[PDB]
Amino acid sequence: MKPYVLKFQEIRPHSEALVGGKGMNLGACSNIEGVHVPAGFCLTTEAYKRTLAENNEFTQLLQRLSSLKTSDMDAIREISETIRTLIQHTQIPSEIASYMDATLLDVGGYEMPFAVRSSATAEDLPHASFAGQHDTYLNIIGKDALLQHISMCWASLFTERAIIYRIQNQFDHRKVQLAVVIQQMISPEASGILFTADPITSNRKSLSIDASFGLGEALVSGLVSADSYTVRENTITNKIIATKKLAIYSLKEGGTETRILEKSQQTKQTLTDQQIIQLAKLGRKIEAYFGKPQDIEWCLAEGAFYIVQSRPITTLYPIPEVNEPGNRVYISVAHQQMMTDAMKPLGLSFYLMTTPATMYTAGGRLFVDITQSLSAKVSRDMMVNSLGQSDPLIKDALLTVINKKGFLPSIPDSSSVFELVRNSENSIKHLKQSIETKSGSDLFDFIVEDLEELKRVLFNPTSIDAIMAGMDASAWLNEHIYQWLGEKNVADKLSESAPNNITSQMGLELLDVADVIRPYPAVRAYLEQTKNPDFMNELATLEGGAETKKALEDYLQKYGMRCAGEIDLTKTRWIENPLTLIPLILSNIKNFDSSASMHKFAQGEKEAFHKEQEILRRLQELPDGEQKAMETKEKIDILRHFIGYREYPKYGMINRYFIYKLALLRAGEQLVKDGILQEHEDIYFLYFEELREVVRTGQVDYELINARKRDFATFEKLTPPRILTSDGEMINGEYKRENLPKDAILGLPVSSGTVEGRARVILEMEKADLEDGDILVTAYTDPSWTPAFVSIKGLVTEVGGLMTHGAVIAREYGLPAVVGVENATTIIKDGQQIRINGTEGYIEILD
Ligand SMILES: CO[C@H]1/C=C/O[C@@]2(C)Oc3c(C)c(O)c4c(O)c(c(/C=N/N5CCN(C)CC5)c(O)c4c3C2=O)NC(=O)/C(C)=C\C=C\[C@H](C)[C@H](O)[C@@H](C)[C@@H](O)[C@@H](C)[C@H](OC(C)=O)[C@@H]1C
Numbered sequence: 001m002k003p004y005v006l007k008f009q010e011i012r013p014h015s016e017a018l019v020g021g022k023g024m025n026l027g028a029c030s031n032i033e034g035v036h037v038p039a040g041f042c043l044t045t046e047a048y049k050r051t052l053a054e055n056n057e058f059t060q061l062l063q064r065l066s067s068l069k070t071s072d073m074d075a076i077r078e079i080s081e082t083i084r085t086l087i088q089h090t091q092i093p094s095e096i097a098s099y100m101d102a103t104l105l106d107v108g109g110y111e112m113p114f115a116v117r118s119s120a121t122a123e124d125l126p127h128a129s130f131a132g133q134h135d136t137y138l139n140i141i142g143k144d145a146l147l148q149h150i151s152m153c154w155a156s157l158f159t160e161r162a163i164i165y166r167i168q169n170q171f172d173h174r175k176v177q178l179a180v181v182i183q184q185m186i187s188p189e190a191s192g193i194l195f196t197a198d199p200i201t202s203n204r205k206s207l208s209i210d211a212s213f214g215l216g217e218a219l220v221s222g223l224v225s226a227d228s229y230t231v232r233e234n235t236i237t238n239k240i241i242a243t244k245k246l247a248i249y250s251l252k253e254g255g256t257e258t259r260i261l262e263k264s265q266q267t268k269q270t271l272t273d274q275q276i277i278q279l280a281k282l283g284r285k286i287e288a289y290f291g292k293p294q295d296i297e298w299c300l301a302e303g304a305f306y307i308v309q310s311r312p313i314t315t316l317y318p319i320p321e322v323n324e325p326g327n328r329v330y331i332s333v334a335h336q337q338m339m340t341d342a343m344k345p346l347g348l349s350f351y352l353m354t355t356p357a358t359m360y361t362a363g364g365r366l367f368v369d370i371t372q373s374l375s376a377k378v379s380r381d382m383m384v385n386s387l388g389q390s391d392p393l394i395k396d397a398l399l400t401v402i403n404k405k406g407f408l409p410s411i412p413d414s415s416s417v418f419e420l421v422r423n424s425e426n427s428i429k430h431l432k433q434s435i436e437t438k439s440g441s442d443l444f445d446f447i448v449e450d451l452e453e454l455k456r457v458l459f460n461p462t463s464i465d466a467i468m469a470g471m472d473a474s475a476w477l478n479e480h481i482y483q484w485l486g487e488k489n490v491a492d493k494l495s496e497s498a499p500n501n502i503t504s505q506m507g508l509e510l511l512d513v514a515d516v517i518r519p520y521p522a523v524r525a526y527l528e529q530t531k532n533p534d535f536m537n538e539l540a541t542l543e544g545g546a547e548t549k550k551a552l553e554d555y556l557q558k559y560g561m562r563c564a565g566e567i568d569l570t571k572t573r574w575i576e577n578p579l580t581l582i583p584l585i586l587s588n589i590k591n592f593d594s595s596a597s598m599h600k601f602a603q604g605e606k607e608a609f610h611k612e613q614e615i616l617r618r619l620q621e622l623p624d625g626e627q628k629a630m631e632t633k634e635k636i637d638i639l640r641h642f643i644g645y646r647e648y649p650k651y652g653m654i655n656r657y658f659i660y661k662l663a664l665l666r667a668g669e670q671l672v673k674d675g676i677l678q679e680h681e682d683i684y685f686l687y688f689e690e691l692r693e694v695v696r697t698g699q700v701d702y703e704l705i706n707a708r709k710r711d712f713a714t715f716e717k718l719t720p721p722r723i724l725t726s727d728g729e730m731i732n733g734e735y736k737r738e739n740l741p742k743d744a745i746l747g748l749p750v751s752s753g754t755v756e757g758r759a760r761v762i763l764e765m766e767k768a769d770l771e772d773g774d775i776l777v778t779a780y781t782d783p784s785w786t787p788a789f790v791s792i793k794g795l796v797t798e799v800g801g802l803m804t805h806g807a808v809i810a811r812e813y814g815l816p817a818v819v820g821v822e823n824a825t826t827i828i829k830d831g832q833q834i835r836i837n838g839t840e841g842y843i844e845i846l847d
């Protein structure tokens with residue numbers, strides 16, 4: 001960390017601290033044979049530190065800047081003006097200028113034009129991007145102009161905009177410096193960007209060129225327009241041709257000017273087809289050198305391609321680490337589970353450790369690998385029809401994938417259920433006791449035996465037979481009563497207020513806990529305005545508190561394990577953060593009168609005796625009439641016995657998960673005491689095996705954890721596709737509006753009825769302030785989301801499928817719901833009156 005200047009040829013690996021990201025990648029690119037990087041050098045961060053960071057006024061100014069927030073806006077406008085003008089007034093030490101004069105003559109010389117380009121780094125974050133944050137000036141000639149523009153580059157580190165960016169991304173201003181790339185200008189016929197993997201599709205196999213005439217500054221700042229071409233294998237899939245009005249050109253005596261292209265020139269294809277393929281190959285060599293897809297800037301001059309920037313890509317949805325060969329197709333677990341939130345590795349692993357599916361992981365969520373199924377004759381073709389009875393877009397997405405570059409070459413007893421339930425209740429009772437004895441590596445040793453027991457109650461053949469009994473029977477009823485009586489999706493109304501549904505009870509019991517809070521206005525005022533996490537220990541103060549805390553405590557002992565994202569072991573359970581239930585307990589205090597759970601439940605079973613006994617009567621004057629009747633009543637009794645249970649096995653699974661979580665946090669806090677972990681919940685970023693070794697060996701790799709931590713962040717920003725490909729193509733299916741109103745948003749019908757109301761688009765149940773009219777539009781809706789179904793008039797989600805909670809819960813609440821809705825939360829606007837049809841599956845944006 002001594003030199004002031006380095007030629008691209010002199011730059012060693014991992015020198016970002018000295019030359020910045022841009023400078024480093026230019027250095028790297030310049031050593032690839034067949035790659036022409038215009039000669040140049042970096043004015044090092046040394047020069048920056050020497051000239052500026054050693055200045056007492058500068059450092060004082062930056063020490064001040066350290067103190068302010070994005071809300072200290074006018075302190076930002078003025079302090080940064082001071083810094084900027086201070087920089088442009090500070091001369092560059094003659095010693096630094098001397099070293100530069102020498103290196104500049106080597107590339108050469110002060111009569112030639114140079115690009116002067118910012119290159120930033122953040123200390124100890126060598127790969128941190130400052131893309132589009134700081135200045136570049138093109139075609140600068142002469143020592144005077146050079147020195148002037150170096151200071152200008154430096155000053156551009158302290159625009160209001162660059163400062164705000166650093167504050168929001170938690171970069172310390174004192175630990176960011178600017179190197180300056182000084183590089184021979186290319187005077188090009190054409191220039192542009194290259195993305196080694198298509199930003200649509202995201203398919204890791206297509207390439208993409210944006211190409212314009214003239215210098216690249218137009219395309220990037222951000223007009224002119226540009227040509228777009230996609231090349232899939234070595235063949236060109238697509239060509240696009242922009243009408244390119246303007247082009248930027250270098251002036252002989254320095255600087256730059258914009259010209260208007262002749263009309264007949266504006267529509268010409270920037271690059272020939274041969275040049276496009278040549279560029280693609282050029283580009284494939286730099287991920288191939290770099291190992292991950294890349295973002296590359298280029299110039300075409302006199303038939304020669306010049307590389308002028310390269311930089312890792314940052315947006316694509318990762319591919320599963322598959323240990324299989326050949327082309328693979330993955331199905332998304334998120335969509336069927338109604339989850340789609342990124343999961344942490346510890347939580348990711350516990351789901352994997354409990355499934356007999358071939359599940360893999362990509363981007364913090366889970367995929368199932370189902371290609372070998374697809375390949376065989378008549379098992380594909382098993383699956384596509386079968387997977388189409390839960391999710392049409394999946395079926396659609398699979399047809400679309402089997403057309404590629406050869407991508408492809410018993411009902412149990414009535415008494416069954418309560419024994420199933422109590423045999424789980426007890427299996428958990430045992431569990432709760434046996435871990436409070438285990439600890440350390442004994443804990444881990446035990447969890448694995450218990451996973452076997454988890455699997456045993458979860459996948460009990462008798463349980464499954466009881467589960468399907470409900471599904472199968474509403475399969476039968478829906479198919480057959482539409483066949484005879486015609487016009488019917490009947491099992492929706494027949495399922496209404498079904499008994500023993502541990503998840504429908506949950507949302508409906510919160511109605512009662514609010515009936516307890518309602519009388520006491522002391523507690524209601526506290527609860528109305530509180531962010532205190534242990535507000536439950538301040539209640540005994542107020543007149544209602546003691547009564548209230550009891551009401552709540554019992555709910556949490558019944559449902560406290562459950563939280564949104566429950567499948568992820570690492571997510572805060574309700575009982576760990578009771579304050580998240582308050583706005584729902586609050587707002588259905590005000591939306592309901594006394595005994596609302598009774599009246600909602602009753603009117604449901606009333607409104608399904610009527611359909612039962614309407615359908616049965618109405619079937620009597622059909623041809624074979626009282627026969628057809630008795631076989632349906634047979635299926636209704638069956639239906640309404642085993643529909644509750646459909647939701648129990650998840651509730652048993654989770655209870656274990658929360659019991660495991662408590663135990664694993666103990667070990668993690670025990671790991672803090674021993675000084676081996678920094679943060680007690682850092683165990684969320686290790687998979688369950690890695691975690692075993694840590695308690696076992698007393699060793700961790702924090703440069704690993706921190707990357708898990710970092711990776712997690714850049715998931716969350718992702719949204720899993722319905723289907724994922726070995727190439728990382730994403731396929732969400734397309735729906736079929738047969739004879740549905742055009743201009744409608746299409747989805748899966750799931751729960752019957754048409755209704756009109758206010759759209760409330762909510763991503764957090766806690767911030768959901770639902771009112772009587774509202775139609776809830778959200779992303780997923782797992783059992784966690786039930787308590788919010790009691791005031792709304794209809795439901796809309798982005799993801800899901802018939803027979804997958806909480807689609808199953810809408811039916812029993814008698815709620816119209818539509819489910820497979822591409823981009824509902826973005827397409828629909830909060831507050832827009834809206835009509836949902838949950839019979840035919842569509843949505844109309846009412847005026
Ligand atoms: C269209 O749905 C199917 C997808 C098929 O395709 C296919 C390739 O894609 C899948 C996706 C996307 C999954 O996410 C998945 C899954 O999460 C899971 C099992 C494991 N399944 N079984 C293996 C055999 N064992 C005897 C029972 C467990 C799976 O196979 C799959 C799965 C597939 O296999 N496991 C679990 O999640 C766990 C840890 C517990 C689940 C418990 C309850 C009990 C389940 O809900 C039961 C009630 C059924 O609901 C499911 C089996 C679905 O079946 C139906 C009719 O809906 C299935 C998601």
Ligand SMILES: Nc1ncnc2c1ncn2[C@@H]1O[C@H](COP(=O)(O)OP(=O)(O)NP(=O)(O)O)[C@@H](O)[C@H]1O
Pocket residue numbers: 022038115117118119130131132133134135136138183184185186191215216217220297299308309
């Ligand atoms: N030597 C060069 N010759 C011709 N055009 C260049 C040269 N260097 C850069 N350009 C163009 O001018 C722009 C300047 O890019 P550069 O400042 O290096 O990064 P940036 O895209 O402006 N922002 P960033 O990448 O985060 O630093 C590029 O987008 C090119 O189109």
Ligand SMILES: [Mg+2]
Pocket residue numbers: 132309
């Ligand atoms: Mg750039």
